[PDB]
Amino acid sequence: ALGVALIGTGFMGKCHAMAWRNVATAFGGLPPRLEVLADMPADKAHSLASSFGFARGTADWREAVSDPAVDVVSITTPNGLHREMAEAALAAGKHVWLEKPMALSVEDAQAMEAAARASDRRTIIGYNYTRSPAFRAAVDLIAEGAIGRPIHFRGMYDEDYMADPDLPWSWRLTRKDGGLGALGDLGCHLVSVMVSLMGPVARVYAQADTVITDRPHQGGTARVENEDQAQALIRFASGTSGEFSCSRVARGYRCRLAWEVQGTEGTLRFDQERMNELWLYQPGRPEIDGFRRILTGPAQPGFAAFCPGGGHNFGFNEQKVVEAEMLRQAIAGRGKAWPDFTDGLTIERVIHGMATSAQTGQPVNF
Amino acid sequence: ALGVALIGTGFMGKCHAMAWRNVATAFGGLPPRLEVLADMPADKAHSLASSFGFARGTADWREAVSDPAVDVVSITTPNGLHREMAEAALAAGKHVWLEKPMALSVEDAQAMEAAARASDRRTIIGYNYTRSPAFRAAVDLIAEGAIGRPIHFRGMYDEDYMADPDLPWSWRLTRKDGGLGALGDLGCHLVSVMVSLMGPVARVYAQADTVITDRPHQGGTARVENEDQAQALIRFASGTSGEFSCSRVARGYRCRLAWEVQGTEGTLRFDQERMNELWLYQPGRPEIDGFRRILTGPAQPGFAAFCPGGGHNFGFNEQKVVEAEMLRQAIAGRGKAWPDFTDGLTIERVIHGMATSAQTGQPVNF
Amino acid sequence: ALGVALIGTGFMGKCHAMAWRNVATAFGGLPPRLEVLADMPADKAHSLASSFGFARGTADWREAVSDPAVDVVSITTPNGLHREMAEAALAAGKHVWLEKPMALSVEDAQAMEAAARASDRRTIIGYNYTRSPAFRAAVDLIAEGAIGRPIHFRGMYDEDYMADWSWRLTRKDGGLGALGDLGCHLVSVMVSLMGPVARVYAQADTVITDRPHQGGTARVENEDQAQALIRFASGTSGEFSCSRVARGYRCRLAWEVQGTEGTLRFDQERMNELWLYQPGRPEIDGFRRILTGPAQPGFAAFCPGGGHNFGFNEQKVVEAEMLRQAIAGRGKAWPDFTDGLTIERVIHGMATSAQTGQPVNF
Amino acid sequence: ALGVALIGTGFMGKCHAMAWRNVATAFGGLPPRLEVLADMPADKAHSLASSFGFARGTADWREAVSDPAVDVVSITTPNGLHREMAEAALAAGKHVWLEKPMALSVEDAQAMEAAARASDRRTIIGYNYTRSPAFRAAVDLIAEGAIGRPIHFRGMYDEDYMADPDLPWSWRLTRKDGGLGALGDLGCHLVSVMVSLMGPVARVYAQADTVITDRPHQGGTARVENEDQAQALIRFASGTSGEFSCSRVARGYRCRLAWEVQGTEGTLRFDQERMNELWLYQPGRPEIDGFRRILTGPAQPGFAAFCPGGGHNFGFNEQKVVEAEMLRQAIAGRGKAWPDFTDGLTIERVIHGMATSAQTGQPVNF
Ligand SMILES: NC(=O)c1ccc[n+]([C@@H]2O[C@H](COP(=O)([O-])OP(=O)(O)OC[C@H]3O[C@@H](n4cnc5c(N)ncnc54)[C@H](O)[C@@H]3O)[C@@H](O)[C@H]2O)c1
Ligand SMILES: NC(=O)c1ccc[n+]([C@@H]2O[C@H](COP(=O)([O-])OP(=O)(O)OC[C@H]3O[C@@H](n4cnc5c(N)ncnc54)[C@H](O)[C@@H]3O)[C@@H](O)[C@H]2O)c1
Ligand SMILES: NC(=O)c1ccc[n+]([C@@H]2O[C@H](COP(=O)([O-])OP(=O)(O)OC[C@H]3O[C@@H](n4cnc5c(N)ncnc54)[C@H](O)[C@@H]3O)[C@@H](O)[C@H]2O)c1
Ligand SMILES: NC(=O)c1ccc[n+]([C@@H]2O[C@H](COP(=O)([O-])OP(=O)(O)OC[C@H]3O[C@@H](n4cnc5c(N)ncnc54)[C@H](O)[C@@H]3O)[C@@H](O)[C@H]2O)c1
Ligand SMILES: O=C1[C@@H](O)[C@H](O)[C@@H](O)[C@H](O)[C@H]1O
Ligand SMILES: O=C1[C@@H](O)[C@H](O)[C@@H](O)[C@H](O)[C@H]1O
Ligand SMILES: O=C1[C@@H](O)[C@H](O)[C@@H](O)[C@H](O)[C@H]1O
């Protein structure tokens, strides 16, 4: 059994815990051993280690990564801690499952990437929207020739978790200790999807805005320093075009990662708010010609491991169980885990190049 | 910790196993101890015990049910075995989580109901479409007067798992194993939902059909004895009207449990194939008047235990985690499990009453 | 060129006026001449005759039906006047485009059916939801075997216009309530898909008993919703409902045909989409959204490019054209007063069934 | 009554003819007199004159624009004839209803705009997607504060009429006698809508592609000179951001002019393939929060002239009737029509500006 350490218990932390708990239930083999859970404060770590099924909890993440009973470390902490935690786990000889984005800067991601290549350990980054059966089905349909050659990509990622101007300021909204805004939180997810469909990015031209520039801060206010929304025109290395956007102030949207690939022989379209649906157009005889609604079921990758009947909606959290299985397989020397820290660094360059472009008014080439 | 025995490992067996594994992760407390898994043959039971995380496996279900390390039994076997397994578990002093429908006949269900009442143990039946955040939010909305007084119910449950006439004669067919056809497999679910929204059923007038009358059975052909579809007009105890249907041959549908409640001051509409959407109409100013798409999120019951952010789709399997929690709380005495075997018996009477009506061409009163 | 009389200028009167005005624009041949428009009061009839392009307006409907320049009479008045006006038009030697439902009772419709046969003139009833390109495409798909054998029909017609005074609420002017105003439409579609009805078991309700803003007593005299189970003459099953109090819905005439080899589904609120399921390879399996376009009957007379949405009013231009071709002996219009009589028997049989709590066989 | 001349009888000629015939039926006043129809050859003009209800047909469009019984001229011919015909009509003292785009080039458009200015006759260009009740309702909602201040526009116009590579080459696909491709045929429509919602365009950065570069050309093949698709980032005069695309090779789309306006207090979204629906999000209480589907009815501008009952779908052709009415009222001195040749020249500058941006890889400021 794989020995597991988990750092953090929040949105992604609990998602990781659920994932590691059921990965063998879904996919077979030996259940991973849930060894050490790290979180703060300590009594929360202890309480949650009990209910999560971990052998023990600790408030010291360094203890978790060095434990001799641990083979792999899930890292779900705030972005500013990612570099230090991943580098320590790799230095301790542990495989790493790091939540996105890799870190605050390209410089940090470059160091992480060299550290991963220096260890002989597997890494995967938590781009969970690449794990849905519908997304994986789309990739396989394209690889099967279902839509011919992609000629255009249009993608967006809209949410409104910051749309309320009275939500408080935080150091996450500074460049120095928050890194990127919408591009860092949501943009990187869209890039992960985008490059899986279209291949590498060659050029971006971007624009960005801070829509709510000031927020409540301990009686007065403080300045929001990173972007609430951004958009970019893409030229892929292949020569094909792309449209790209993200926003954390797009009112009414909650997880609207939506993309489409228009090809020479068809079109694929997806919206994460309805993650069980994949829309596929292929030319057909005029009397019946039209897009097909493909409802997620056992014909799509991964789904059969959770349910034998179609239309029993696959959930957001189950994307994480798939992601866990990919890592287990990679550790065991079968499949590859995508993206590792090398593949991840590329994604980091793209989002930071979009930010640089928006700042400078000039395109950025890769 | 509650000691768990699980009988069966198919569609629902694995779903229960996943639910028991993650119930404390989601809702806190102590994780249940996964003690014994029973399945046949023995080889498979030991293999699945290992991957599901159960302390041992056996091919002898009777032994599992009377293991003193077990407190509660999940029963996920075909319908013809429910009665015998449930009565034995209850006789051994074990709580029971029973898959729907209760058994083959109303008489079977009355027996099971009596055994449950005599045992003084908690029961819950696997009507998991009553556990979605959207459904539970709908019930609360109705109670709050969001749509006024209900004036009409229209419900359906379409799937196509038997639509292909080449599918071999399996279990769900005939009177052994399955009992009723679409009414037993799907209709029962629709009733569980319907009565939760509208209250008890006073009268039904029904019709039914067998659309595919024969199937391949190991080189011969065997007759299909139960119904592929059925429809009924309803009068509820309230006086309100209802329409009701189910089908296992409705081509293109996979899990189309869909319902709407029309009221004096609005309308609620839902489709399980998009189980994260609840449609609500309430009167508004003419310029902005229309149905609202309510996307599932932490405002709805149960969701916040799985994810803090709205629009991260809740899945089919997570309904079963919610059901596990309701059973835990009921066992601990902090809540009511619905439906228990008594509540379940009423559901059985409704579906069998519709069968009677379809056979006689006469309405059936309750 | 057909000479046209139009009686009534409301919802349907204006729709007929626009249909007659553009039938030749869309389908060729000679533009119909708009001869006489009848409505009350007279000054309204004069005004609308001018703007609609009719040679005259009159407050006397008999004046419209007796005009020698008229070949065909559109009757778009309240239901209580349909019988008298249609019988007079037919006696006068005019073809008749009659709004649904036929009249107030089965007896009325029987008298009208006999009159139509005696007159040797074409009739058509205004069941305009049978005229969409999507609907006509569906009928043809079913005839071609695209969904195999129909095994179940489920239809509904929800609107909410009564949930918030109309002659529709009286038995002398409207007749039946929801069954008469909306039910008949769903019947026209249902029988066109499934064939004739053999049996109904029905139920009904009045939810709003009195119009609360009328001041004086304003008793709603007929049903607000009804539902039925159907057996078709084929033996196949059906579900049927209608409502004028289903809040949020405005023209939700929605139906599906579940076949042994596929399913077709439609909702009039998105009248340009027809959903077709047929089994396919596991990897691509699912319903197709067929967007209305020139491959569908009638569309190409209005637009050569797919996806430019066909409108409700354009259904009426198609209806007019069907009448025009029937008059010229080039096709049969559906439904004539004989086909329409059967539809009346169905909705009135549903009403009887709901009153008695008993099934009604046809 | 207004005396009408109509030049051309194709897609738009028939659409204009239907509009002229029903404009007084819908909106009152006097029916326009259908005086002269022009098309080639003569047999075709005489036949269509008869069926469209025009007093006469001719093969000589000059005679048509010169007739003293004509007050207004509908020009629905191919793009390379617009300028000559429009200048001739204005010089003959006639009002003009001109199909989009204005001409092949900005220079032609400047010249036509100069002619119009000196004419004292009314002009309107055929931007019919600005005439839907939904679009007009959206514009009014934004003015009323329904979504607060706009903070992002995203628009697209996908069709697939050129997607098949075996469709034969033609001179419209030459820059000389075709002008722009997808920008000229579809892009201009999207600009018309975009500027009406967001205000004037201040800056664009664009890219464009020809996807199918060569098409069967009697015997051999030949070259396509203008673009199949184009995308742009926008800054409006308000400072607000935008995304913009068009394509004539986007498979499965037929008339997918779709746009979205995200504001500080809400979101509006529309797709012309479902032209009777307008989606409006405004913040709501957590239990009922979500987008409203506004179905087109008499509450929206123009609808009541065609039907008194909501939900009876307004069609594409009826947009043209509304456009006819606006011109009618402008001729009567009872309201300015939009867009006239001055307003339209700005739209032409935008689309040609995007083409210039795409060719240079440089932003273009207006
Ligand atoms: N892949 C996705 O879909 C996705 C979704 C949401 C968030 N995220 C990512 O997950 C990470 C955390 O986001 P969240 O929304 O889960 O945040 P959160 O605040 O919900 O959770 C952060 C967790 O880290 C813990 N933590 C903080 N400092 C710590 C320390 N020094 N030692 C141990 N634990 C510590 C917190 O107590 C908490 O349990 C971020 O990188 C974020 O981008 C990814
Ligand atoms: N609530 C729901 O959503 C839902 C969904 C699917 C099925 N079900 C119900 O679950 C039950 C089983 O359905 P399924 O689809 O999981 O069937 P299945 O055929 O997938 O699984 C049946 C399981 O029972 C086992 N079994 C049979 N006889 C046994 C015995 N004597 N001892 C031990 N194990 C035995 C089989 O090996 C198998 O593991 C049925 O009652 C059905 O109505 C419920
Ligand atoms: N096919 C459809 O989709 C559709 C839609 C609406 C109405 N209808 C039907 O069309 C008919 C008319 O309905 P409506 O909604 O247009 O009603 P309406 O009230 O809008 O119009 C009725 C018209 O009849 C006129 N009228 C009344 N008494 C008259 C008389 N003695 N002489 C001349 N004119 C008279 C009224 O002034 C008015 O112009 C009804 O039978 C109704 O069922 C059909
Ligand atoms: N607003 C819209 O939604 C919309 C839709 C389609 C086309 N258009 C525009 O309408 C115009 C026409 O496009 P179409 O699709 O109708 O093309 P088309 O080829 O269908 O029609 C052009 C018409 O002009 C006629 N014509 C050509 N040369 C002529 C001459 N010398 N004299 C008289 N008539 C002549 C043709 O015979 C034909 O009847 C274009 O400018 C196009 O951009 C607008
Ligand atoms: O309980 C069930 C449904 O959930 C499920 O959707 C069906 O496919 C199964 O056959 C049925 O047993
Ligand atoms: O014909 C009719 C329907 O088309 C229409 O939808 C209803 O609103 C009308 O009341 C009815 O008379
Ligand atoms: O104006 C146009 C669009 O409305 C229409 O949708 C396209 O098909 C036409 O090519 C274009 O001329």
Exposure string of B276-286, with b = 16+ CB inside 10 Å and e = fewer, is: bbbbbbbeeee
Strands B201-209 and B150-158: unpaired
**All domains of chain A in start order, with CATH:** 1-125 (3.40.50.720), 126-366 (3.30.360.10)
H or E element that contains C52: helix C42-52
Ligand 4 within 6 A of CB of D78? yes
Tell me if D76 sits within 8 A of D6, measured CB to CB: yes
Distance (Å) from the alpha carbon of B21 to chain A's nearest alpha carbon: 7
> Of all helices (H) and strands (E), which one includes residue A347?
helix A341-360
CA distances from D13 to C325, D7, D31, D39, D97 (A): 25, 7, 18, 10, 11
Ligand-binding annotation for D189, yes or no, is yes
CB < 8 Å to C309, chain D? 255, 272-276, 313, 315-316
3-state secondary structure of A217: strand
Residue A227: closest CA among A243, A204, A250: A250
Experimental approach: X-ray
C-alpha of residue C167 to centroid of ligand 3, in Å: 9
Which residue bears the tokens 């929207």? Answer: A129
State how far the alpha carbon of D162 is from the alpha carbons of A291, C347, D7, D182, D249, in Å: 18, 49, 26, 10, 5
Q: How far apart are CA A67 and CA A6, in angstroms?
A: 12
Question: Which structure tokens are listed for D327?
Answer: 């011109």
**How many CB atoms lie under 10 A from the CB of residue A164?**
12
How many angstroms separate the alpha carbon of residue D275 from the centre of ligand 7?
Answer: 15
Chain C residues closer than 8 Å to B152 by CB: 205, 225, 227, 241, 243, 246
Q: Return the amino acid letter for A190.
A: L
Taking every pair of C-alpha atoms in chain A, what is the biggest distance, in angstroms? 66
Rounded CA-CA distance A356/C7 in Å is 70
Q: Residue D141: which of B287, B291, B300 has the nearest Cβ?
A: B287
Instruction: Compute the distance between CA of residue C278 and CA of residue C286 in angstroms, rounded to an integer.
Output: 8
CB B31 within 8 A of CB A11: no
Is the CB of B185 within 6 Å of ligand 5?
yes
Cα A185 from Cα A178, distance rounded (Å): 10
Number of Cβ atoms within 10 Å of the Cβ of C210: 12
Cα(D349) to centroid(ligand 7), Å: 19
Q: How far is the CA of D14 from the centre of ligand 4 (A)?
A: 10
Contacting subunits of D (3+ beta carbon pairs below 8 A): A, B, C
C39 lines ligand 3 (CB under 6 A): yes
* Residue C32 to residues C23, C71, D353, Cα–Cα distance (Å): 8, 10, 48
CA dist C193 and B52 (Å) reads 51
Q: Which other chains touch chain C, taking contact as 3+ CB pairs less than 8 Å apart?
A: A, B, D
Q: Which residues of A touch D (CB under 8 A)?
A: 147, 151-152, 154, 156, 158, 164, 205-207, 209, 211, 229, 231-233, 235, 240-241, 243, 245, 247, 249-253, 262-267, 281-283, 290-291, 361, 363
Name the residue among D164, D231, D265 with its Cβ closest to that of A233.
Answer: D231
Q: What residue ranges in A13-119 does DSSP mark as E strands?
A: 33-38, 56-58, 72-75, 95-98
Residues with Cβ within 8 Å of C162's Cβ and at least 6 positions away in sequence, in order, are C169, C208, C220, C224, C244, C245
Q: How far apart are CA A124 and CA A121, in angstroms?
A: 10
Cα separation of D226 and D351, whole Å?
13
* Exposure on the CB side of residue D134, measured as CA atoms within 13 A: 30
Q: Does residue D299 contact residue D308 with C-beta atoms inside 8 Å?
A: no
What does C126-141 look like in DSSP terms, one character per residue?
A: --GGG-SHHHHHHHHH
φ/ψ of A257, rounded to 5, equals -85, 105
Indicate the top mutation candidate among A44, A99, A131, A248 to test ligand 1's pocket, ranked by most ligand atoms within 8 A of CB: A99
Distance CA D337, CA D95 (A): 12
Residue of A6, A7, A11 best suited for mutating to test ligand 1, as the one with most atoms within 8 Å of CB: A11
Q: Which of C140, C135, C174 is nearest to C155 (CA)?
A: C135
Q: CA B163: distance to chain centroid?
A: 21
Taking an 8 Å cut-off on Cβ atoms, the answer to whether B251 and C277 are in contact is yes
B307 closest CB neighbour out of A53, A309, A316: A316
Q: CA separation (Å) from B145 to A251, B260, B292, C208, D69?
A: 27, 15, 16, 18, 65
The three-class DSSP label of residue D97 is strand
> How much distance in Å is there from the Cα of C269 to the middle of ligand 3?
22
Taking CB atoms and an 8 Å cutoff, what residues of chain A touch D265?
251
For the CA atoms of B110, B111, B114, B120, the dihedral, rounded to the nearest 10 degrees, stands at -120
Return the H-helix or E-strand segment holding B363: none
**HSE-CB of B99 using CA atoms within 13 angstroms:** 25
Ligand 2 atom at shortest distance from the alpha carbon of B44: 37
B287, β-bridge pairs: none
Residue C49 near residue C103, CB atoms below 8 Å: no
Calpha distance D77→D73 (Å, rounded): 12
Residue C158: its H or E element: strand C150-158
Residue closest via CA to ligand 1's atom 25 equals A8
d(CA D193, CA D195): 6
Contacts of A354 (CB under 8 A, 6+ apart): A183, A187, A204, A206, A208, A230, A232, A244, A364
Eight-class DSSP state of A183:
I
Q: Looking at residue A177, what DSSP letter applies?
A: H
* DSSP 8-state symbol, C219: B
Residues in chain C within 8 Å Cβ distance of D15: 303
SS3 (DSSP) at C179: helix
CB pairs under 8 A between A and C: 52
Query: How far is C95 from C325, CA to CA, in rounded Å?
Result: 12
D39 CB within 6 A, ligand 4: yes
The closest alpha carbon to D248, from D223, D268, D226, belongs to D226
Compute how many other C-beta atoms are within 10 angstroms of the C-beta atom of residue B365. Answer: 11
